[PDB]
Design an enzyme around this catalytic site. Structure first.
Site, short mmCIF file in Angstrom:
data_model
loop_
_atom_site.label_atom_id
_atom_site.label_comp_id
_atom_site.label_asym_id
_atom_site.label_seq_id
_atom_site.Cartn_x
_atom_site.Cartn_y
_atom_site.Cartn_z
N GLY A 250 10.73 42.20 43.46
CA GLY A 250 10.84 42.04 44.91
C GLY A 250 12.22 42.14 45.53
O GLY A 250 13.21 41.64 44.97
N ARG B 59 13.26 39.14 53.82
CA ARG B 59 13.35 37.99 54.71
C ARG B 59 14.42 36.96 54.27
O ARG B 59 14.70 36.04 55.03
CB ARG B 59 11.97 37.35 54.94
CG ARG B 59 10.92 38.30 55.54
CD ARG B 59 11.12 38.58 57.01
NE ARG B 59 11.07 40.01 57.30
CZ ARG B 59 10.32 40.56 58.25
NH1 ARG B 59 9.55 39.80 59.02
NH2 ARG B 59 10.33 41.88 58.44
N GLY C 259 1.48 47.23 43.58
CA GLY C 259 0.67 46.03 43.44
C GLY C 259 0.94 45.29 42.14
O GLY C 259 1.46 45.87 41.19
N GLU D 95 -11.57 36.65 49.58
CA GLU D 95 -10.43 36.71 50.52
C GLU D 95 -10.82 36.24 51.91
O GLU D 95 -11.99 36.34 52.30
CB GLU D 95 -9.81 38.13 50.56
CG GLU D 95 -9.19 38.61 49.25
CD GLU D 95 -8.11 37.78 48.55
OE1 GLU D 95 -7.33 37.07 49.24
OE2 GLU D 95 -8.04 37.86 47.30
N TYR E 128 50.90 15.26 40.56
CA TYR E 128 50.33 16.43 39.93
C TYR E 128 50.76 16.39 38.49
O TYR E 128 51.96 16.43 38.23
CB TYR E 128 50.82 17.77 40.55
CG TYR E 128 50.36 18.96 39.72
CD1 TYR E 128 49.00 19.18 39.48
CD2 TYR E 128 51.27 19.83 39.13
CE1 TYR E 128 48.57 20.24 38.68
CE2 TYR E 128 50.85 20.91 38.34
CZ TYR E 128 49.49 21.11 38.12
OH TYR E 128 49.05 22.16 37.34
N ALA F 208 54.26 7.09 41.46
CA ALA F 208 53.79 7.83 42.63
C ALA F 208 54.73 9.01 42.89
O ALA F 208 55.93 8.87 42.73
CB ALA F 208 53.79 6.91 43.84
N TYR G 298 59.81 26.59 35.93
CA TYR G 298 60.82 27.48 36.51
C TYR G 298 60.05 28.70 37.06
O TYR G 298 58.90 28.93 36.67
CB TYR G 298 61.79 27.96 35.41
CG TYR G 298 62.61 26.83 34.84
CD1 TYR G 298 62.21 26.17 33.68
CD2 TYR G 298 63.77 26.39 35.47
CE1 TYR G 298 62.95 25.11 33.16
CE2 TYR G 298 64.51 25.32 34.97
CZ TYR G 298 64.11 24.69 33.80
OH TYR G 298 64.82 23.63 33.32
N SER H 27 59.06 6.90 40.25
CA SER H 27 58.46 7.57 41.40
C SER H 27 59.25 8.78 41.89
O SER H 27 60.49 8.75 41.93
CB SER H 27 58.27 6.57 42.54
OG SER H 27 57.31 5.60 42.15
O1 LIG Z 1 3.15 37.77 44.11
C1 LIG Z 1 4.29 37.40 43.86
N1 LIG Z 1 4.72 36.07 43.88
C2 LIG Z 1 3.90 34.97 44.21
C3 LIG Z 1 2.54 34.98 43.96
C4 LIG Z 1 1.74 33.91 44.31
C5 LIG Z 1 2.31 32.81 44.92
N2 LIG Z 1 1.46 31.73 45.26
C6 LIG Z 1 1.62 30.96 46.40
O2 LIG Z 1 2.58 30.97 47.17
C7 LIG Z 1 0.51 30.01 46.63
C8 LIG Z 1 -0.73 30.28 46.09
C9 LIG Z 1 -1.74 29.38 46.34
C10 LIG Z 1 -1.47 28.26 47.10
C11 LIG Z 1 -0.20 28.07 47.59
N3 LIG Z 1 0.81 28.93 47.38
C12 LIG Z 1 3.68 32.78 45.14
C13 LIG Z 1 4.47 33.85 44.78
C14 LIG Z 1 5.28 38.42 43.46
C15 LIG Z 1 4.87 39.73 43.23
C16 LIG Z 1 5.78 40.69 42.87
C17 LIG Z 1 7.11 40.33 42.72
O3 LIG Z 1 8.02 41.30 42.38
C18 LIG Z 1 7.52 39.03 42.94
N4 LIG Z 1 8.91 38.62 42.82
O4 LIG Z 1 9.15 37.51 42.35
O5 LIG Z 1 9.79 39.38 43.22
C19 LIG Z 1 6.61 38.07 43.32
#
Ligand SMILES: O=C(Nc1ccc(NC(=O)c2ccccn2)cc1)c1ccc(O)c([N+](=O)[O-])c1
Ligand SMILES: O=C(Nc1ccc(NC(=O)c2ccccn2)cc1)c1ccc(O)c([N+](=O)[O-])c1
Ligand SMILES: O=C(Nc1ccc(NC(=O)c2ccccn2)cc1)c1ccc(O)c([N+](=O)[O-])c1
Ligand SMILES: [Mg+2]
Ligand SMILES: [Mg+2]
Lengths: 450, 450, 450
Positions: free
Chosen positions: A11, A15, A78, A151, A363, A377, A384, A402
């Site tokens: 990663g 941010r 992914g 999801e 010192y 003190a 030198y 001192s």
């Molecule tokens: O998915 C990554 N990290 C990751 C995955 C899952 C979580 N889980 C949570 O934050 C989480 C899950 C469930 C409840 C509360 N928090 C936190 C961090 C990830 C993927 C690729 C990467 O390259 C990196 N990285 O560290 O750079 C992280």
């Protein structure tokens, strides 16, 4: 059964608004990824496969000494694609644990419980309960086993009320990982190969997926920005402080205590508010540390009291020594038992013998001071111009008056006495008294301009 | 449409137990009322009508430079009477926002949303939801519009369960304010003319009152005592720290960080616990600030590291400079790039050239030091008795030996060398070596009284 | 009606992992048991019966001056056995309050309300409501009176939902205690004589037991380890800070303020973050204390400003004095009105007269300094070797030039002037100007090794 780890650490951490890649930001003085590497090591991992990408050169410089397999990922497609990069190195008969470089608080204890629950040819999935699970993949258990990770966008009204969510942390054997990763697709809104899909693939193969609840939510939390990182930092600091308190360290305020490394302690240790412990620190019995001290890589003997606003580094302090307030111990300062170092005193790469005192505005650098010396003190050891930091050697039972300058290279033998305001350039013999001959002009009836 | 503000600031603040009037107590180093004046200014207010009364002379001295209209209220007869004092100055066609000097956290963002919602010839009332609304005036909405503010003592059982309450903050046009304020009565238990009554008067005139919910409760909270003021302070500090963290400033502990003014920062800035930033501060890229530092009105270049317990004020620090621990920069200290300032060192109204070092137990005042100078431990710049702080001028590549006194007015030219323990009163020429001739008495066989 | 107290303090406190017995661990600088002794004293207790056992010798040394009756318990057979040890000393017609050395936050106000509710020949039991009462003895009230304390293991489903629990704190008359304690049995899983059983015995005798709810849970909480002790510490500190804030002391951050003793204050006092107040401290009006200061047993006059990182002990500071930053006042430092003490300055057992200044890198010890003196940077008062800390006496309107050593015993009379870099061994007369005659070697064309 053997174990190896895979840690995702490629990663960018956009941010964080940093030139560093995401996982190099520190928690308690060490990179987030290093916490994860150390946990995987504590677990007994034979191999640690490190998936890296962004800030590759910085990852290599900052983690040069880590016993990891460097798996350079060129494209972010992914989490399943990331883990598949390490898959050719998985042993069919070993267990593989998947961890995240940006979720550093995962514990060895939680992971041991996860590995133990893993059914043969199946998966052990780390899950967590959330009061507000909104946005997270819901755990669907049918006949005790995990049948789906639903999801947010797909969940029905009843499923949105499930508090148990997926963390991403999982364990399976190397052969099962290799097999199932080759079957993960990217047919979703993000067009990514998700490691999450291994739960559905395991179910297709009639392999059981067992859920293991994490003890604390903070163990699975990832840091995407410095605000989140600061929240993990405070949780980690509170946990370290709580453990020390239960071991019998009197930490006056656990919310104003920081440990950035390791602390070895004796009994009846007292630590006042706003103290920082860095690197490897060892405190003996009844050590008292006053407010605002900074101890980095120090060994402190029994019964030492460090008074407020003292900064110590790469130093050794003998038993019953008294330091501070406002003392500065720089690398190589070695104080023997029953020594005294006072306010506005700086000791650098010097040994100070038993019972010796250096109590004010001094010192002492590149010196050896014997036992029962009195360093007045304003005393300064100096060189030198153009010198190469030469040594000042002071024997036992020497009095240094001192505001005396000791001009290295110089030796002051046992029992010598030096008067106040002296400039020492020549060696002083045993029992030699050296006093300055002053010439002064005295003007009577000098009326001040007041 | 134009805007002007009215700020209520006449209160005594009896429960502060202070000689100051209520609104002069500070939040983040500036009076509560000043926060409100600045917010009203940020909104684009043409006029800011300041209602004042108690501690009138102190209000005038502490806020002398504020672009406000001073509206001196002689009698406290309620909030409508206070606002009516400014009413002759309202433009019929401008919007008027009513704010409170003791509720300083009101945001420009909240107020923009309030002004925007104001219907023509109507009122926009700022409201807030409370988990426990007990004691506050309940918002009665009928047909989307505010028909009444029902006080605690009058509310029916069903109305006491309304969580939406009145904040006192409102917007209406100048003509509507003038008209409705002349109609407010004091027929109530307190015998006061309440601004609250404008909602009922607007309804009598068939003018709509629209409610606008504040984002945070803390924006509408007023401080009646120092405990409440401290709670607003901590909320404000947490908010400032959170914003900095999201911008990429690494603040190790946001609960141990204080900003009392403005901070301009680069990338990869690290701020350790217990740092205080005052006035206008600018930090370049990769600035590291150690524990316990105080920076007030300073400019710090890129790659500077400030070590623990350093106090800097009205100073400039060039890139790659190294300060601290325990360094003191007083007003006018100007450190060039790659300079070094160490422990128990005080720099006052002096310029220090590139690569120069002043690393121990030194006072440098009213001086100019050139590039690549070595200022030994214990060096002090001083003056004769009755002098008027004269200057010490040190050239480039000068070595000044430890514990030397430089007696201003004096000049030390380029490449000069000064031996340890010297008293400099006369100008030192280029490449001049000045060493002290010591006279010493040596007494052999001097047995110490031990 | 008279009152006496019994305090249980025999515990080992195994989980503290300390050589001290349980109750000697401190809250706000004083032993937990001392808080309880002081509360019992504030209540008007004629006698305070102290049950002690483990660490008996340490209890005696640490509490030598407490007006308590030392009741040495040889065997721990339960709380009723402990209280029965003091029972032969109870007056039949006096009230007896039972308190615990490890539950230090019990208030005089709570205990007054408990004593007042005590029915004649009955018991007043201190109770508390818990959101989660699991593990605690449930209060059974029938006809307004306490009929039973039902333990966790015995409670029915309905009784487990009772939130009101037993605290152990109770009041009854001496005759009733003597009578009922002789009737307590040990027929239970622990084989101990529980003081709790007095409720059932009172009911057997048709004597009423009235419940009195404690205001805060923290008043009844006991500390079994240092984590629990730290939680009581933070609660106590927050309460002290909140009281000071309501009295009008401006404490910038109540979470970063510590009071370990007593504070007397005037109006408009400002205390910045991370200040520690120890022993007995008195601050006049408009005293400003900067960040990181430590004040122990000091009297500070009106309008004094103490700048950051100043440590003061057993010292007196006159009105309008200015101290710090980084000043050190050691015991016996007495600063007169309008004096100035600066950075890296140490004052020990010395008086400094009105308007005098000691602003840099100075040690003043065992001295008397008159009014309007100017003590230059680097000045040090010192002694000959083998001396017994002799005095330096400086008159009024004396100028002492920078880096001068004053060799005690020595006197400097009114209006004398001392040049920089001087060694003073002989008394200086009124209006005497003393300047050092320097001999220097000047070498032209000295090219530095650069
Ligand atoms: O998915 C990554 N990290 C990751 C995955 C899952 C979580 N889980 C949570 O934050 C989480 C899950 C469930 C409840 C509360 N928090 C936190 C961090 C990830 C993927 C690729 C990467 O390259 C990196 N990285 O560290 O750079 C992280
Ligand atoms: O009414 C005044 N201030 C004021 C008014 C309203 C509030 N609002 C709240 O505290 C509040 C409201 C709703 C919910 C929560 N908090 C807070 C402060 C006022 C009036 C006259 C004055 O002269 C001053 N002043 O500042 O001196 C203040
Ligand atoms: O029982 C003792 N202490 C004690 C008793 C009761 C409590 N109460 C609670 O902690 C409590 C009660 C109810 C609700 C919440 N907390 C806390 C401490 C005790 C007994 C013998 C001793 O010798 C000592 N001691 O102080 O060493 C303490
Ligand atoms: Mg000196
Ligand atoms: Mg000198």
């Amino acid at each position: 059964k053997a174990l190896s780890a895979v840690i995702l650490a490629a990663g960018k951490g956009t941010r964080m608004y940093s030139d560093l890649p995401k996982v190099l930001h520190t928690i308690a003085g060490k990179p987030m990824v290093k916490h994860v590497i150390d946990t995987a090591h504590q677990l007994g991992s034979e191999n640690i496969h490190l998936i890296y990408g962004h800030g590759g050169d910085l990852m290599r410089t900052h983690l040069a000494n880590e016993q990891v397999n460097w798996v350079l990922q060129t494209e972010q497609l992914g989490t399943a694609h990331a883990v598949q990069q390490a898959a050719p190195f998985f042993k069919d008969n070993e267990n593989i644990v998947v961890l995240y470089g940006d979720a550093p608080l995962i514990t060895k204890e939680t992971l041991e419980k996860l590995i133990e629950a893993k059914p043969e040819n199946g998966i052990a999935l780390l899950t967590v309960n959330l009061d507000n699970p909104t946005g997270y993949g819901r755990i669907i258990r049918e006949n005790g086993n995990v049948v789906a990770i639903v999801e947010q966008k797909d969940a029905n009204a009843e499923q949105l009320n499930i508090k148990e969510v997926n963390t991403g942390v999982m364990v399976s054997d190397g052969a099962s990982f290799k097999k199932w990763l080759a079957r993960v697709g990217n047919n979703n809104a993000q067009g990514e190969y998700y490691l999450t899909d291994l739960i559905a693939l395991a179910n297709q193969d009639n392999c059981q997926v067992v859920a293991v609840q994490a003890t604390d939510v903070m163990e699975v939390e990832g840091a995407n920005n410095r605000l989140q990182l600061a929240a993990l930092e405070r949780y980690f600091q509170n946990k370290q402080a709580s453990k020390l308190l239960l071991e019998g360290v009197m930490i006056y305020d656990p919310a104003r205590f920081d440990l950035r490394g390791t602390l070895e302690h004796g009994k009846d240790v007292e630590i006042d508010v706003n103290v920082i412990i860095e690197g490897n620190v060892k405190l003996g019995d009844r050590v008292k540390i006053g407010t605002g001290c900074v101890l980095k890589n120090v060994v402190i003997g029994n019964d030492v009291e460090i008074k407020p606003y003292s900064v110590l580094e790469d130093s050794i302090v003998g038993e019953k020594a008294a330091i501070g307030p406002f003392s500065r111990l720089r690398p190589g300062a070695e104080l023997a038992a029953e020594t005294h170092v006072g306010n506005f005193v700086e000791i650098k790469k010097s040994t100070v013998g038993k019972g010796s005192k250096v109590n004010h505005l001094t010192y002492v650098g590149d010196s050896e001071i014997g036992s029962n010396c009195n360093i007045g003190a304003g005393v300064i050891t100096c060189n030198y111009d153009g010198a190469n930091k030469f040594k000042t050697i002071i024997g036992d039972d020497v009095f240094v008056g001192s505001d005396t300058q000791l001009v290295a290279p110089v030796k002051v033998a046992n029992g010598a006495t030096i008067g106040a305001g002296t400039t020492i350039t020549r060696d002083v013999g045993e029992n030699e008294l050296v006093i300055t001959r002053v010439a002064q002009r005295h003007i009577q009836g000098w009326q001040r301009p007041i």
